[PDB]
Scaffold this active site. Structure first.
Site, short mmCIF file in Angstrom:
data_model
loop_
_atom_site.label_atom_id
_atom_site.label_comp_id
_atom_site.label_asym_id
_atom_site.label_seq_id
_atom_site.Cartn_x
_atom_site.Cartn_y
_atom_site.Cartn_z
N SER A 1 -4.62 0.03 2.19
CA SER A 1 -3.78 0.25 3.38
C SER A 1 -4.39 -0.43 4.61
CB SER A 1 -3.60 1.74 3.64
OG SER A 1 -2.79 1.93 4.76
N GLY A 2 -3.58 -1.21 5.31
CA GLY A 2 -4.15 -1.89 6.48
C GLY A 2 -4.97 -3.10 6.06
N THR B 1 1.65 -6.15 4.04
CA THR B 1 2.83 -6.21 4.83
C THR B 1 2.74 -7.35 5.79
OG1 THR B 1 3.02 -3.82 4.53
CG2 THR B 1 4.31 -4.85 6.33
N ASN C 1 -4.04 2.55 9.75
CA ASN C 1 -3.38 1.41 10.36
C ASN C 1 -2.15 1.85 11.14
OD1 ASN C 1 -2.76 -1.27 10.97
ND2 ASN C 1 -1.61 -1.55 9.08
N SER D 1 1.31 1.18 9.13
CA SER D 1 1.53 1.45 7.73
C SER D 1 3.02 1.60 7.26
CB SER D 1 0.79 2.72 7.37
OG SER D 1 1.01 3.01 6.01
N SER D 2 3.43 0.89 6.23
CA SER D 2 4.75 0.99 5.73
C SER D 2 4.91 2.45 5.29
CB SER D 2 4.92 0.00 4.59
OG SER D 2 4.25 -1.20 4.95
N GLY E 1 0.36 0.68 -3.76
CA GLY E 1 -1.03 0.59 -4.28
C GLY E 1 -1.53 1.96 -4.80
N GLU F 1 -3.64 5.55 -4.48
CA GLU F 1 -4.31 6.30 -3.43
C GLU F 1 -4.78 7.65 -3.90
N1 LIG Z 1 -3.65 -12.18 8.85
C1 LIG Z 1 -3.51 -11.17 9.77
N2 LIG Z 1 -3.67 -11.46 11.07
C2 LIG Z 1 -3.59 -10.57 12.09
N3 LIG Z 1 -3.38 -9.29 11.94
C3 LIG Z 1 -3.25 -8.94 10.66
C4 LIG Z 1 -3.33 -9.75 9.57
N4 LIG Z 1 -3.16 -8.98 8.44
C5 LIG Z 1 -2.96 -7.75 8.91
N5 LIG Z 1 -3.07 -7.67 10.23
C6 LIG Z 1 -3.21 -6.52 11.09
O1 LIG Z 1 -3.61 -5.41 10.41
C7 LIG Z 1 -2.57 -4.41 10.44
C8 LIG Z 1 -2.42 -3.88 9.01
O2 LIG Z 1 -1.26 -4.51 8.40
P1 LIG Z 1 -0.27 -3.57 7.54
O3 LIG Z 1 0.97 -4.43 7.11
O4 LIG Z 1 0.07 -2.35 8.31
O5 LIG Z 1 -1.07 -3.19 6.19
P2 LIG Z 1 -0.55 -2.76 4.72
O6 LIG Z 1 -1.42 -3.32 3.71
O7 LIG Z 1 0.88 -3.23 4.53
N6 LIG Z 1 -0.58 -1.09 4.68
P3 LIG Z 1 0.73 -0.01 4.56
O8 LIG Z 1 1.94 -0.75 5.09
O9 LIG Z 1 0.40 1.18 5.43
O10 LIG Z 1 0.85 0.31 3.08
C9 LIG Z 1 -1.37 -5.23 10.86
O11 LIG Z 1 -0.37 -4.37 11.39
C10 LIG Z 1 -2.01 -6.10 11.85
O12 LIG Z 1 -2.48 -5.25 12.93
MG LIG Z 2 3.01 -2.42 5.98
#
Ligand SMILES: Nc1ncnc2c1ncn2[C@@H]1O[C@H](COP(=O)(O)OP(=O)(O)NP(=O)(O)O)[C@@H](O)[C@H]1O
Ligand SMILES: [Mg+2]
Ligand SMILES: [Ca+2]
Ligand SMILES: [Mg+2]
Lengths: 777, 153, 142
Positions: free
Chosen positions: A168-169, A173, A215, A218-219, A433, A435
């Protein structure tokens, strides 16, 4: 073709002296694995000197880890490595991360360790510098990958899929997007269906995502956008099927966490005209259903984005009406989260509760009457009480936010649906994923069930890359994780949980708990009872179980209801027929009146997912969470590793590949008859009497089944105690003989001694000797 | 089974032991394995403990006719070949060069297998006239030939 | 040998009082209670039967010489010990040698040991075999 815009996309030293078996990796506690130069041996204990800390310590030789040389550092593709082990993987990346690269490859696996700041890597210039480029030229970038999937869709002519995962984070996404964002820049003619699709995010991300302790974005739904095409060009269309939104959020916000982004962005005053369309005072603050935790997300503007949301919402071809008809529904929850009581009746301020009426188009008074303690069908009525009432209000809150979210998406799929000739599709999945938390029940199970299914498709494609060196190294070999499907089955198979929470559901808690244990419990390796592994801030469960990630203790408390929503029938019926389209539609009587438990759809939804994945040449992407601090550049060893533990490195049931060059220095001792000659083992093999289906001698390596290479160690162990104690017994004998002569001499000498003496003690007792001695004057 | 002139290679050396226990016509199981060494052998203590044999001095003593099935049993006993004694000292050679420091060597046999008293080890070296370089490492390869190639060569 | 039989000789004067040149029963028991205690009658006689033939210096010198026979030399004893004084100290540990004679070998016996060491030359723990030998049979000293 180098170095113009390649500042953070892709020389230095060749040499500073590296040695061979004098240098290697050692387990540190702060850095995970710290570098070291060895000093001496003593059995298991090994004396080694820390490189740039400079101070030595004891180490078992089995924790020590191999290390690669220099011109092999900060490597683009780790598959081309000599030591793709733990302390090596965790290095290369770190080296590259700390150096402004985020993307790396390891075999058919993508590696982007999340950089918490923005980055120039996305300019059309770069994009251009990419398309059509074969993999081995251009430095590592999601682009390169995103590209070859089409490079491959066309020519090979089949659908491809792109599974982007991590924790996560991690970045799932955030790339899934950057991805559709790329594919986009290859179509145009001679706000753009392209630019329409790009907007589908701000919409679903608004309503769908949320700020998490982890994060801030988070989706909460499983997404799988499909992107079709025309026989020739750019896209033909696309579509979206989402999976399992968190309904829970809507009413409860875990401390330091909040409700869905929209809700808060609804009270920011961007377009005040609507304050009045919303019957809402634009203060985030003392509304209830959305403020249990933070109300502010730092470095995240509620007005700007909201505007952006409104703005987008339009380009989606949403009428001004449809546009509004959403905010509306959405605001109504803000209010119902308010409807006080005092009793089985006391509706204190029927003054707000007044308010939900105008919004759904149902007289509020009719509604507060018909289901404060009002009735149902068979119709009859029976006293709804002050609490379920409260817990029946959210019944309505959530039971809709879902029907609404559902609709929204179902509606987006409608404008993104041009019906032009479609041939192939690039499906991108941005799902959950595995958890494990200090409490895992039902919601938190399906994320897992869905993943397990995702593992079958995973190693399904490994058994396959595996037979890619059953061809590489001339060998034919003739389950290897056959309990995995014994989990899959254990869960999804007909006499299982699912086939039951669905079936056995005179239903209360143990009516339901009994069948489970009695049937495939007591007696299954996987489905077993619990125990205490001390989860830390951890808590309550009823059952345990194993997944290709380890196990996790579940609970079964109030699920037969948890799999459903108590929208109190008439409240619904009353809502069922109302005047607000969305509302009235969101609650329509059936095909006809006078179905769903959450899984009937998920098992259905999921099954469907898989089906298509197998209809695609997949591509895997791996997202690593550099660290817990949301800070870019930082590395949290202990975490990175945890992640590498279950994806592309060791901890499933396959053959243990091994080079001869090693099999020598390894088990050579289990067969001491030989004199190089790479065949130094064919012999050891036979020289052991092994049943060989159990093994296969490929060329420069050897493959054994499981526990094979295992027993070799168990034998090699018991084998050398003997061989040593043998050579000890030798030394021992050489001693008892080094001195035998010596002994036998003495044996004589003594005989002399205890003989003469034993006589010089008779001579003085002989009558005459006395007398003689009586007189030598 | 063993020959008659062999049933003698046993009468002769036990008449040295019945000695250093006292001429009585018996010896102590403790000393058993020891006799069996004098007769060109190297059984393991675990072994001699199978064939009767005894832990501490003075426990149980035996005459010839019981002390007999001993030798023979402890005769059909596994011994070691040169390889074994090298294909096992290789797991301690990191340079692969063929050296094992003394500090180690000691530990190897003083700490592993049927551990050896520091004493034995001290003599066994004196005898085999071993030695280390200025680096303090030893060429074990040889050492295994001296001990294997018996007391008086 | 030399003084040895001449010493043994000068001794015959002694034994024989009548100086008849023969040593009778009534010829021994006399010089007996003349230098200490005398034997028993039968003892006397039992000492004459040991003289198959009657009593003179050569039947005498005979039965006597008939004993210091089956005994080793001296240096072969002053050396038989030496085999257990590896570092040549010319002395052993009184609990060592002693350990020897009673636990291992031709098992001496207490009565035997007691009577053995009853006059042995032990110093600070060190049994001097050199002289326990030099005297087990008679040292050269004057
Ligand atoms: N390449 C990237 N560049 C800049 N910021 C990024 C990048 N990848 C992720 N982030 C940052 O990190 C945060 C985490 O991304 P996020 O899509 O919320 O994670 P995730 O894996 O989809 N988790 P979840 O959606 O909660 O299952 C983003 O909202 C941005 O703040
Ligand atoms: Mg997400
Ligand atoms: Ca004896
Ligand atoms: Mg006379």
């Amino acid at each position: 073709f180098s170095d113009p815009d390649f500042q953070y996309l892709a020389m230095k030293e060749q040499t500073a002296a590296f040695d061979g078996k004098k240098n290697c990796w050692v387990p540190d506690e702060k850095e995970g694995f710290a570098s070291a130069e060895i000093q001496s041996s003593k059995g298991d204990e090994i004396t080694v000197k820390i490189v740039a800390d400079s101070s030595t310590r004891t180490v078992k030789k089995d924790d020590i880890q191999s290390m690669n040389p220099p011109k092999f550092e900060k490597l683009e593709d780790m598959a081309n490595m000599t030591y793709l082990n733990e302390a090596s993987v965790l290095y290369n990346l770190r080296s590259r991360y700390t150096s402004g690269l985020i993307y790396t490859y390891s075999g058919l696996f993508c590696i982007a360790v999340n950089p918490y700041r923005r980055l120039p890597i996305y300019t059309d210039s770069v994009i251009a510098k990419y398309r059509g480029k074969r993999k081995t030229e251009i430095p590592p970038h999601l682009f390169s990958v995103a590209d070859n999937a089409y490079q491959n869709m066309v020519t090979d002519r089949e659908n491809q899929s792109c599974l982007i995962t991590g924790e996560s984070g991690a970045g799932k996404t955030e790339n899934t997007k950057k991805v559709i964002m790329y594919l986009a820049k290859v179509a145009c003619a001679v706000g753009s269906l392209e630019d329409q699709i790009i907007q589908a995010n701000p919409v679903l991300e608004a309503y769908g995502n949320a700020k998490t302790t982890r994060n801030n974005n988070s989706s909460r739904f499983g997404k799988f956008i499909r992107i079709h095409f025309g026989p020739t060009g750019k896209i033909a269309g696309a579509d979206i099927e989402t999976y399992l939104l968190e309904k829970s959020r809507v009413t409860y916000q875990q401390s330091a966490e909040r409700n869905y982004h929209i809700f808060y962005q609804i009270c920011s005053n961007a377009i005040p005209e609507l304050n009045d369309v919303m019957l809402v005072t634009p203060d985030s603050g003392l509304y209830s259903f959305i403020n249990q935790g933070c109300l502010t997300v730092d470095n995240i503007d509620d007005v700007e984005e909201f505007k952006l949301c409104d703005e987008a919402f339009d380009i989606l071809g949403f009428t001004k009406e449809e546009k509004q008809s959403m905010f509306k529904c959405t605001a109504s929850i803000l209010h119902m989260g308010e409807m006080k009581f005092k009793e089985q009746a006391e509706s204190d301020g029927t003054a707000e509760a007044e308010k939900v009426a105008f919004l759904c188009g149902i007289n509020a008074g009719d509604l507060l009457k018909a289901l404060l303690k009002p009735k149902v069908k068979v119709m009859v009525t029976k006293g709804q009480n002050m609490n379920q009432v409260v817990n029946s209000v959210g019944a309505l809150a959530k039971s809709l936010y879902d029907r609404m979210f559902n609709w929204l998406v179902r509606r987006v799929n409608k404008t993104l649906d041009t019906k032009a000739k479609r041939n192939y599709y690039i499906g991108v999945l941005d799902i959950a994923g595995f958890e494990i938390f200090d409490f895992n029940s039902f919601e938190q199970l399906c994320i897992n069930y869905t993943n397990e299914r995702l593992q079958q498709f995973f190693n399904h494609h490994m058994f396959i890359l595996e037979q890619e060196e059953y061809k590489k190294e001339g060998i034919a070999w003739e389950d290897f994780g056959m309990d995995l499907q014994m989990c899959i089955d254990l869960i999804e198979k007909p006499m299982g949980i699912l086939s039951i929470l669905e079936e056995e559901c005179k239903a209360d808690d143990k009516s339901f708990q009994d069948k489970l244990y009695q049937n495939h419990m007591g007696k299954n390796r996987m489905f077993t009872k619990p125990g205490k592994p001390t989860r830390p801030n951890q808590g309550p469960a009823h059952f345990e179980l194993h997944h290709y990630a380890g196990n996790v203790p579940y609970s079964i408390t109030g699920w037969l209801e948890k799999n459903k929503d108590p929208i109190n029938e008439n409240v619904v019926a009353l809502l069922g027929a109302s005047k607000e389209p969305l509302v009235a539609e969101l609650f329509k009587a059936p095909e006809e009146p006078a179905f769903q438990t959450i899984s009937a759809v998920h098992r259905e939804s999921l099954n469907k997912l898989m089906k298509n994945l197998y209809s695609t040449h997949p591509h895997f992407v791996r997202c690593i969470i550099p660290n817990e601090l949301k800070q870019p550049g930082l590395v949290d060893a202990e975490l990175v590793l945890h992640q590498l533990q279950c994806n592309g490195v060791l901890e499933k049931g396959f053959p243990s590949r091994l080079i001869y060059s090693e099999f020598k220095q390894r088990y050579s001792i289990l067969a001491p008859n030989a004199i190089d000659g790479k065949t130094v083992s064919e012999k050891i093999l036979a020289g052991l009497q092994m049943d060989p289906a159990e093994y296969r001698l490929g060329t420069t390596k050897v493959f054994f089944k499981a526990g094979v290479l295992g027993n070799l160690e168990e034998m090699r162990d018991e084998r050398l105690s003997k061989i040593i104690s043998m050579f000890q017994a030798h030394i021992r004998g050489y001693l008892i003989r080094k001195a035998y002569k010596k002994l036998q001499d003495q044996r004589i000498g003594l005989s002399v001694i205890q003989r003469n003496i034993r006589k010089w003690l008779v001579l003085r007792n002989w009558q005459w000797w006395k007398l003689y001695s009586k007189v030598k004057p | 089974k063993l020959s008659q002139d062999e049933i003698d290679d046993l009468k002769d050396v036990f008449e040295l032991f019945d000695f250093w226990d006292g001429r009585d016509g018996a010896v102590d199981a403790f000393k058993l394995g020891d006799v069996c060494r004098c007769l060109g052998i190297n059984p393991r203590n675990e072994d001699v403990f199978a064939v009767g044999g005894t832990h501490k001095m003075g426990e149980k003593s035996l005459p010839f006719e019981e002390f007999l099935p001993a030798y023979e049993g402890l005769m059909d006993c596994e011994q070691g070949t040169f390889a074994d004694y090298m294909e096992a000292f290789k797991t301690f050679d990191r340079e692969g060069q063929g050296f094992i420091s003394g500090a180690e060597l000691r530990h190897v046999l003083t700490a592993l297998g049927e551990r050896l008293s520091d004493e034995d080890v001290d003599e066994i070296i004196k005898l085999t006239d071993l030695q280390e370089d200025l680096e303090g490492n030893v060429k074990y390869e040889d050492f295994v030939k001296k001990v294997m190639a018996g007391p008086y060569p | 040998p030399q003084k040895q039989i001449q010493e043994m000789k000068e001794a015959f004067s002694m034994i024989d009082v009548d100086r008849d040149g023969f040593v009778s029963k009534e010829d021994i028991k006399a010089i007996s209670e003349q230098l200490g205690r005398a034997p028993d009658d039968k003892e006397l006689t039992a000492m004459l039967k040991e003289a198959p033939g009657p009593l003179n210096f050569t039947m005498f010198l005979s039965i006597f010489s008939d004993k210091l026979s089956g005994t080793d030399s001296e240096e072969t004893i002053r050396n038989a010990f030496a085999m257990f004084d590896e570092q040549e100290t010319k002395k052993l540990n009184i609990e060592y040698i002693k350990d020897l004679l009673e636990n291992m070998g031709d098992n001496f016996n207490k009565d035997e040991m007691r009577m053995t060491f009853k006059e042995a030359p032990v110093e600070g723990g060190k049994f001097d075999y050199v002289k326990f030998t030099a005297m087990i049979k008679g040292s050269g000293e004057e």
